[PDB]
Design a protein around this ligand. Structure first.
Ligand SMILES: CCOC(=O)CO/N=C(/c1ccccn1)C1(c2ccc3c(c2)nc(CNc2ccc(C(=N)N)cc2)n3C)CC1
Lengths: 252, 10, 27
């Protein structure tokens, strides 16, 4: 997270770390949506241009973490992957469209003060909050600058940007399954997700029921925190039906 | 610089 | 989920984190 700050303990209990066994390293960010389901970006698992195509056994999910590199004894829980499900229409060829994936854990994770699921938005929640200017929150253990690594989970609050502005900031073709966030050059404030943060959650706290909802998944960006550029996010609600069906098909 | 995690998960 | 989005160390004990108000002020 570029220009973020250290997370408070228990501030993001749904934060999950996609961790590679060999060599042991951070692969991506992710989120806890139930005791057996973790949500992340499809590109974290499958991304041919970067020679990425992990199988369940290559991965480990670390939940309840705060510190980046330290094994948090008596706090974090490390789960194994039973199955990986990538959106059947995720398009890594043209533009990372429908960049979403579900990972079912081998056995249910126990909730605690540091482990708790975030909500997925319903049509109405999405309609009211997914508006230009409304701020969401991005968290992760990714790079602090485009060109080090944090000691602790980082967090930054970023405003949703008008679609025309998002489109006019890049040569990439934006789809409806994406939204962008971040400050404009004249807005003064800054911050953005960066390498190591992708797959992570973009959440918003509904002022209607005071619950946190995951509106986006860190998907792509051109550099990190560059003036005139914005972080792009998978529109979670637009692809919820796929989520529901997977969870009600192979789910538990 | 990742600290060794219980070999039990590997 | 019936208890989703309510944090044990915050919402559950009516404590607010240091920057959530920034979010709410933008809505
Ligand atoms: C390094 C050279 O790359 C290239 O020449 C072409 O990159 N092509 C694209 C692209 C994006 C969307 C649709 C089509 N093509 C890209 C690109 C492509 C795939 C990407 C990507 C960035 N970023 C990620 C994941 N990591 C990531 C996510 C968000 C970030 C941010 N908000 N600053 C910073 C990093 N994945 C996964 C340059 C922006």
């Amino acid at each position: 997270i570029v220009e973020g700050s250290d997370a408070e303990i228990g501030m993001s209990p749904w934060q999950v770390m996609l961790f590679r066994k060999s060599p042991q390293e951070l692969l991506c960010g992710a989120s806890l949506i139930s005791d057996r389901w973790v949500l992340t970006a499809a590109h974290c698992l499958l991304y041919p241009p970067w020679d990425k195509n992990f199988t369940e056994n290559d991965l480990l999910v670390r939940i309840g973490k705060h510190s980046r590199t330290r094994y948090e004894r008596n706090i974090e829980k490390i789960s194994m992957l039973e199955k990986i499900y990538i959106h059947p229409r995720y398009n890594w060829r043209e533009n990372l469209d429908r960049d979403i994936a579900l990972m079912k854990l081998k056995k249910p994770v126990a909730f605690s003060d540091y482990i708790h699921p975030v909500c997925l938005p319903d049509r109405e929640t999405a309609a009211s909050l997914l508006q230009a200017g409304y701020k969401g929150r991005v968290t992760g253990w990714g790079n602090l600058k485009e060109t080090g690594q944090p000691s602790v989970l980082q967090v930054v609050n970023l405003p949703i940007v008008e679609r025309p502005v998002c489109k006019d900031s890049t040569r990439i073709r934006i789809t409806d399954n994406m939204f962008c966030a971040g400050y404009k050059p004249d807005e003064g404030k800054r911050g953005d997700a960066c390498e190591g943060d992708s797959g992570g959650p973009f959440v918003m706290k509904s002022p209607f029921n005071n619950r946190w909802y995951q509106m986006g998944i860190v998907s792509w960006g051109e550099g990190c925190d560059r003036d005139g550029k914005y972080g792009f996010y998978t529109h979670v609600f637009r692809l919820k039906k796929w989520i529901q069906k997977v969870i009600d098909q192979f789910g538990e | 610089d990742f600290e060794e995690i219980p070999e039990e998960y590997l | 989920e019936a208890d989703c989005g309510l944090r044990p160390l915050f919402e559950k004990k009516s404590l607010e984190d240091k920057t959530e108000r920034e979010l709410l002020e933008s809505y």
